[PDB]
Amino acid sequence: ESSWRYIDTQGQIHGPFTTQMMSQWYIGGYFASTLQISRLGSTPETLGINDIFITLGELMTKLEKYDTDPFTTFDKLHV
């Protein structure tokens, strides 16, 4: 699993935190879409997000590109 850092409201960097920890906090409502996050570059990845800070909202927008339509998305999850 990945690890992540984030920048808080005052500018302080926190982490590394596992995907599990970040996911839990997100689902818990602790993170605004404006929050800056960074994925630690533990593995190569083609999205280009390793070690940079982008907003949560920007990360979500990037990930949406993979979900082109519900038919392919259904098959990718279920077939």
Swiss-Prot record:
GYF domain: residues covered? 1-57
Report the subcellular localization: Cytoplasm
Q: Which domain of life is it from?
A: Eukaryota
Q: What does the UniProt function comment say about this protein?
A: Suppressor of the MYO2 gene.
- Summary of subunit composition and partner proteins: Interacts with EAP1 and MSL5 (via the GYP domain).
Q: Which family does it belong to?
A: Belongs to the SMY2/mpd2 family.
An additional note in the Swiss-Prot or TrEMBL entry is: Present with 486 molecules/cell in log phase SD medium.
What protein am I looking at?
Protein SMY2
